[PDB]
Amino acid sequence: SMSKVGINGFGRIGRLVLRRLLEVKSNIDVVAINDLTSPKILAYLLKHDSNYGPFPWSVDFTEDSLIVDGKSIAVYAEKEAKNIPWKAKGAEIIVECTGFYTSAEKSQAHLDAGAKKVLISAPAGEMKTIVYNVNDDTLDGNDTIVSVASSTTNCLAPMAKALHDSFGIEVGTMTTIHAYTGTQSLVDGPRGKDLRASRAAAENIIPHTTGAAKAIGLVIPELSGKLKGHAQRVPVKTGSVTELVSILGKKVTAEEVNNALKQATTNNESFGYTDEEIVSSDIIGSHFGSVFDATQTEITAVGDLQLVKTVAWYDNEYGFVTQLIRTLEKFAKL
């Protein structure tokens, strides 16, 4: 049905979309890219990656294009999605990764410029928001603009889904200890209105708001309004970890929690398990959206009260991208 993709925002996520497509020998082809710079610079960045090393395929450029593994890809530099000649090269599905079109409204522009669907790499208000292998069954043939939420949502949802199915989550709160991202600052200085995002990212633990828990309802309707949470951004370049403290509907042991999660992760391409004593750098390059860590499970019980802490690692860049692509391969065949 659909096999031709445009990327808007050839950034950390945008470039990795291309990387992953090619790694899996997908039959979707990226045919156009829009950003704000030259093909020379986009090529430079695609070839040389500080988190994942040299691109595995040949890369070259001309004044209006990239050439990747011998195939040509048009490069545009339109600040406004309207102006992208998606039509020209035949781009059916826009992977929207700029951070500036996070609305059904705004991503409309891509359809105006002639693409048939848009997948947004971020939370985008009230729309179909898919975590692959949690709720991608809610996607139908009539969907045109869908969100794959945040990396944190891809981490939290599968862990929350398994606990809720096995035990029931009554209420919970999350904290993600999260790699710093391009929304933060290199040195202390203004970064819009958010005071904390103004601070040097590689030199600080920085509290930071996230909607992963607040909006979990879109992905797991039964948990709607039952979770809150935030982040602490810390000085690692990628690789993050989400802790969820829940009140569950049954009394449990750690062994029981971990066996329920082991079952949910078995033959599960999206959601991995470990009982090894890994650290964040071990998750870099993960092909899961989320890796449940059984070594960090903790049950605090005082009589009838019980707090359950469960922890899952995630490569907020590559890991999340593997989910984005799963959802895209599916969305393209409807």
Place this chain on the structure above:
Amino acid sequence: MSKVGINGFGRIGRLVLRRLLEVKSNIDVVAINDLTSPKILAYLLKHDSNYGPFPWSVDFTEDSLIVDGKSIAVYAEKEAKNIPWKAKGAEIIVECTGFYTSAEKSQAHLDAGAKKVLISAPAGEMKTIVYNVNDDTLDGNDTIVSVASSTTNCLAPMAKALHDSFGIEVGTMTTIHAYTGTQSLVDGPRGKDLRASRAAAENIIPHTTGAAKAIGLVIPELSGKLKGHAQRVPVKTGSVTELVSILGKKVTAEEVNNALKQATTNNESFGYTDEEIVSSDIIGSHFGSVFDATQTEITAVGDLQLVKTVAWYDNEYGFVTQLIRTLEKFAKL
């Protein structure tokens, strides 16, 4: 006032001297034991990667440091029973090596001639003090005492206020904690803790801590009610403790915050902030703990409520100010 000897002139031990001089303490530090030469200890005291130049002059001789013109004997005895504490009359040993964290181990300082030992770490079931939480339990018969971990000193005042105002039924803690000398610079063996083998400045590293588990030593009413752990991360000092609690009363954020504010009023140990601070803003703190009203979160569904409360701490200097407050009291008893 009392003469002190410091065993282990490391991150903590050096900052103990710094803080004593800074507050113009009546304690005199007369001796230091470590594993190295006066020249290396002089170099490390003068030049600090986290706190900058030492604020006083530092020199060394073959067997001493000269700090602000005052002589401090230097010994290099790896067994504490061999340290000649009597030679300069060191009465109270500030035990900062990590290698004597029990009554039975620190007894070796009493054997070597000291009267009392204050241990800069958890040390099993001994009197364990967080200043301005339970320092009123000290008395003139105590000879070996612990000030627990920096995390305990962060946790305890926040837990005490919550418990006193609302009751804590159960809770769990995670501290996002600066890396420390127990970890590894490059991936390599670090005893039996597998995760401690990993490169500390390049990883988020889960790490076990007893701060919550043994909180009953400091706040007896909370024995068995808390658990927790740490995530060690690449900042050089400056840490933050989150506690998620079920309290005995339904609350709003403002109510929690006001109660904490009252607990920090005229409290030289426990500060308050409603500013959007980050960990480097806690470096050099003179509190053991600073509650952060900006991160308070109430998650409520029917009659169920989870309360998240967060406090910052400088696990080096901030904790040290607590250690020093405890030392000054312990010395006058």
Place this chain on the structure above:
Amino acid sequence: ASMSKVGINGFGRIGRLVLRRLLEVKSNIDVVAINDLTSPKILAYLLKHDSNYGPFPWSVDFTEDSLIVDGKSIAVYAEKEAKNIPWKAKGAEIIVECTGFYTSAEKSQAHLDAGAKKVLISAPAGEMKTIVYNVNDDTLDGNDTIVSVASSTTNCLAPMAKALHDSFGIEVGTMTTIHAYTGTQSLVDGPRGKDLRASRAAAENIIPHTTGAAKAIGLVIPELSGKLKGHAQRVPVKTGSVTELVSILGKKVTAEEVNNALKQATTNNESFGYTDEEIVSSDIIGSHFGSVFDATQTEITAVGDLQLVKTVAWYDNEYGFVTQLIRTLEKFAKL
């Protein structure tokens, strides 16, 4: 009856420390206005809390259009074009231009159009009068209206080069500065104008970086004009940097003889310090010198008559440089 009222344009790393240092030295200069691109609330937050130097040592509060610092009111404007900044409202006479966007006489004379009398630019700014304090500040006079203090790297390099050239002659030389990362770099890998290297994650890489410190040294030491080149390697430290110079000197030397010459050049010299301690970059953070010559790193490599001389100086590229900018400013205001 000297100029005493300052405006700061660009209340950034450098601009905020300009205020800090002025208060710290109890300058008779008052900062009466700040221009940047944001709210007083944000500026007050950034001034109070600093990731590199810790809590501001004086009280900080703000209103809808001002900061109140140590009880003194300072106007805040948000004009992206310098020509629009209302410097006359509080009588700002000298502008300390710290934005990075007005690094030429042609650009910075906008402040004059906007009612200021003089401008001191916290950066190289082409071929205008350029001062490294205690190297060539004697060249400033009453007719100088727009002046540059060059880069932190020039303030590190110049006093060392000057001492060497005066004592032995420098016939030719090349510099490399191992330099803390700065806000011209990138947090994550992504476009950063046209410099490909500046696009790379600054806290995760050693990044070669072009600098004019050596190339334009003739503005400060005219006898070395065109005799030096160099570059930077940007590395993951937040502040604190070090400059190595490899020279061919006009004389055969020993390390001790170079060290002693430098030691004499640093005696009673508030701008240029000396060390023979085994210091590392965090020990220079908050330095009150523009440059600290490190005798422990001096190296003479000689084969017959061919001799190469390596000299190394530390610098706190933020605060240490700022101390130099402030010395130059105090003198500028009294000419």
Place this chain on the structure above:
Amino acid sequence: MSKVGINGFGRIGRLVLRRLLEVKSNIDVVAINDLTSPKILAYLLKHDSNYGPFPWSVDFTEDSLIVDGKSIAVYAEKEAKNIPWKAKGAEIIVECTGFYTSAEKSQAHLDAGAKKVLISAPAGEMKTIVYNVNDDTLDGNDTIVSVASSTTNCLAPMAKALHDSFGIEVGTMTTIHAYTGTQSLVDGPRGKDLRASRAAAENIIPHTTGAAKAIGLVIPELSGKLKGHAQRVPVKTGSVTELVSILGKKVTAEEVNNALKQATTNNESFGYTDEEIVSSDIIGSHFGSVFDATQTEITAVGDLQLVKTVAWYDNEYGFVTQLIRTLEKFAKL
């Protein structure tokens, strides 16, 4: 000789095995000596903070690792003379501890039953090989040999190329070098190197290296003609070496670049780039050195000329590829 033992299963020792498996060497690693348990060595081999997951299966028993299905004996003898190398017939020891960097010290492996030792570091006046610079000097009667430092492996190919084309009359080197396990995580004693005592991820740290001073072992004509030092900085691996030379001939940058381009043609050890790379781009390199044409700088005044040339190196994996090339050759003489 196809059976090898590894003394010191650290950053270099583990990558030695990783690379041997990666190139499908016929070398058989039969034994490893270190200071710890198989469990711990297994965890370290499996999880690498710089290079990611080990590409082969790893298990262990109480006295062995099993790597890609093959058993490797693990010993824990802190003195090399006691390591039982004859048990599994380890003939060539790859000496990677840092504790045996001299003929006299590494002799202990031979007293312990091995036939040859290749030392992963400089080791005084003994045969010292940078592959594809002077590996032809390896001789069938050599039994103790060095591959010098990573810095040497970076410097030597560049210096050889320049010397062969233009003559190097005198030169000085500075390497901007990733931090290593000889440094400290937090400020604390580290033998007698004061600079080594400082927190490695939080400082620029000047550091002594023999790479230039001992270059005469590799390129005898350059003996005594180079000096240099390092600045250790906060990157986990990946380094850069700058050489400032007076050459024998007047040159342009294009001419230097062209000559270096030629030395790197069909040279598996010495690579070339004219892309604007940064240090993380060298991580995982299969070269000992990658000359970077983009940083070549000629400074000329009248008749005088200074030539600055620069090459990148993965001080871990890149150097290891050189160690393996040398090992393969050494095994067959």
